[PDB]
């Protein structure tokens, strides 16, 4: 039911993905799927040496802001593809991009080129930006 | 081929397991399978309020040191069951213990009562005590 | 020559202290991340403030690879570190009406930001969380 | 009243500094962990020194739940923290020939150990890595 993503695991997954995206010279840039794609974008950008980073912001679908063009030469990175509503729109608007995510649930999974971790459709994922390291009582209260 | 266990993930897995082992009053103590079982033992001991913690030390099988008795009322905890050579001996020498591990590869998996994470037989597992947080060059060298 | 080593958890603690000072969220049109250093702090602020409008500026007569349009009115501009003031001056030139904020500030960058969380000595040898990872190390024996 | 918060990574850094001082490994029959606090540092030392003989002592006229036999000759005895000296005095009584070591020492425990890595003020409010975990926190918005 619950899946907890720590910062160190997200980075491990993002670095695994960056290794698959070598060589860096094949890319013009990275488009982050906001807000969830910002952290994995920053990690891929650091690993690949890519300084051209842009965003697409999707909120009944509303586009708040988008990077221009059809995605040719670009990585488009998400943290999670879930229902496939956002992934459908991204795959459609950037048809020539290499569309990657860290996490894929089944409804989103076949709409990306690549993902690192499969998660069941009904699992509640907590990303690192949703959590804090806090005191936790012994589970037994003893 | 490679599976990296961070300290924070090991703890998450050990706390999940401790929750399954409630209530704490059903246990006389915990036996750690040394050396790998020491860290998960300490986490279970903290979560369960259990102060009676002992070890079994197995090294062609040699027993360097073992806790006395048949395991009745005890949790026996390992970090990993791998080939099943150690898990066979532990399951045999502590037949009444509740034998748990964090990680199970298939050859060891059916010799425990409970485990948290399945790992493929041929995956090289790095436990937190095998690693350090160090500077890492950008994968691209750019 | 001690390394100042930032953990993911410490970066998030500092980003949250900053996000608290930027409340209420309603006052902002969005966040502009200074690429690449500002992307992770932008993801944190955007979660904390419930802001979905996030854009970037990618700096090289000021030359840019890419920039969010406008003079920054209504925007938070976020960097991880203002160090020499080189990037800080290009942000003030491009976005004179943004609220320009940083996690870390050295004295050369400090005068050019609206807010920072942690100031460090100019000489500080700073490693951000994305510069470090767990790697195998042989036993000491 | 600041919390002194130990991370897993910092505990391991300190345990490794200690393991380096205990080389060579050949000089030890084994390690006795002071339960429960010493179990995690025992797992680290045992990996670093390549020691497979690890035993425990579980303290309550000194009363124990369980103890490794003998007077400690050839053994490292490891605790996480010597605080009041209450546990430290029971270890010296039971294992007068052990090399008694700790990660952390407060002044009341300090005189009763052979080695420590980090000394902290007697009043320090210390959280070990196993007292903390990642938990959901609502956004600031
Ligand atoms: Cl989706
Ligand atoms: Cl085994
Ligand atoms: Cl940069
Ligand atoms: Cl700067
Ligand atoms: Cl205790
Ligand atoms: Cl003590």
Curated annotation (Swiss-Prot), chains A, B:
Co-factor requirement: Mg(2+)
Family: Belongs to the purine/pyrimidine phosphoribosyltransferase family. XGPT subfamily.
Species classification: Bacteria, Pseudomonadati, Pseudomonadota, Gammaproteobacteria, Enterobacterales
Protein name: Xanthine-guanine phosphoribosyltransferase
Function statement: Purine salvage pathway enzyme that catalyzes the transfer of the ribosyl-5-phosphate group from 5-phospho-alpha-D-ribose 1-diphosphate (PRPP) to the N9 position of the 6-oxopurines guanine and xanthine to form the corresponding ribonucleotides GMP (guanosine 5'-monophosphate) and XMP (xanthosine 5'-monophosphate), with the release of PPi. To a lesser extent, also acts on hypoxanthine.
Family annotation (PROSITE patterns): PUR_PYR_PR_TRANSFER
Keywords: Cell inner membrane, Cell membrane, Glycosyltransferase, Magnesium, Membrane, Metal-binding, Purine salvage, Transferase
Organism of provenance: Yersinia pestis
EC numbers on record: 2.4.2.-, 2.4.2.22
Membrane association type: Peripheral membrane protein
Residues reported in the UniProt entry to bind 5-phospho-alpha-D-ribose 1-diphosphate: 35-36, 78-86
Binding-site positions, Mg(2+): 79
Location within or outside the cell: Cell inner membrane
UniProt cross-references to HAMAP family, sorted A to Z: XGPRT
Binding site for guanine: 82, 125
Enzymatic reactions: GMP + diphosphate = guanine + 5-phospho-alpha-D-ribose 1-diphosphate; XMP + diphosphate = xanthine + 5-phospho-alpha-D-ribose 1-diphosphate; IMP + diphosphate = hypoxanthine + 5-phospho-alpha-D-ribose 1-diphosphate
GO cellular component terms attached to this protein's record: cytosol; plasma membrane
